[PDB]
Design a protein around this ligand. Structure first.
Ligand SMILES: Nc1ncnc2c1ncn2[C@@H]1O[C@H](COP(=O)(O)OP(=O)(O)OC[C@H]2O[C@H](O)[C@H](O)[C@@H]2O)[C@@H](O)[C@H]1O
Length: 248
């Protein structure tokens, strides 16, 4: 059996190549200035925030903190959760999307490449607790690996100064894909700040410079769903301070 919605999701999954980084920056240009973007930082899981925003949102995308070598990352982690409660993994393994993992496997570097996976209308089937929803809710998803900072530190430390130059260059492509497919509502988060070991305050600043810069106004509403189980909330806190300008 195939679960409803999946067939059309796999058909519509498209790949964005490194050479299309130019056309993705033009897409930001055409969307810049469209809304008076309002912004918020919540302690939600990516899918919880998505469902919350679903009703009011015209076009709703979520960012998957993906692995660069395995669909679902080989399985705590956000991509592992997206795959338990939705249709993601059937879209990430679609034949058309395989160059993303193929090239990244040859890559030789823990910075990875600038392939992205857009998956339209990914049904969320289950809530955080693992219970089925009375009906599935669709959410478009953008898949991009943040550079593995921890793998870099162990293998090519001469590459550490390019970690942030990659995170920026790549977060601009994510927002590029999102403007490209004319999304109104984004759920972002602490991309690369767990298993991949980048600093949260660094990632959060990156996004900020983008949303007051090349992507200022490209989106109606951007939610940072940072799930942070620790009592003193380090990852979450960094996103609140570094984004307190934009949520006011
Ligand atoms: N369901 C969730 N929803 C929202 N935020 C979450 C969630 N889970 C964790 N966070 C927060 O997001 C932060 C980072 O989540 P991480 O999963 O490490 O993504 P990465 O980009 O660092 O690593 C990607 C690789 O790790 C995976 O294995 C992939 O398969 C790849 O192999 C966490 O600290 C949480 O605060």
């Amino acid at each position: 059996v195939r679960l409803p919605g999946l067939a059309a999701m796999r058909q519509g999954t498209r790949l964005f190549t490194p050479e299309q980084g130019e056309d993705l920056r033009e897409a930001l240009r055409r969307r810049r200035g469209s809304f008076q973007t309002t912004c918020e930082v919540t302690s939600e899981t990516t899918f919880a925030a998505a469902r919350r925003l679903r009703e009011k949102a015209s076009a709703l995308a979520a960012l998957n903190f993906a692995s660069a070598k395995n669909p679902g990352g080989g399985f705590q982690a956000q991509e592992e959760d997206l795959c338990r409660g939705s249709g993601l993994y059937f879209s990430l393994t679609s034949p058309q999307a395989e160059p993303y993992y193929a090239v990244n496997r040859q890559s030789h570097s823990a910075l990875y490449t600038d392939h992205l996976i857009y998956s339209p209308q990914v049904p969320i089937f289950r809530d955080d607790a693992g219970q089925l929803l009375p009906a599935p809710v669709p959410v478009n998803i953008i898949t991009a690996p943040a550079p593995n900072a921890g793998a870099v530190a162990q293998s090519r430390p001469e590459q550490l100064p390019q970690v942030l130059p990659t995170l920026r260059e790549r977060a601009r492509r994510v927002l590029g894909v999102a403007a490209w497919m004319e999304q109104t509502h984004l759920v972002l988060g602490a991309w690369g700040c767990g298993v991949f070991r980048n600093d949260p305050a660094g990632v959060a600043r990156t996004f900020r410079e983008l949303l007051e810069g090349e992507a200022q106004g490209a989106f109606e509403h951007v939610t940072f769903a940072v799930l942070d189980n620790h009592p003193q909330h380090p990852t979450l806190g960094a996103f609140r301070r570094e984004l307190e300008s934009l949520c006011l």
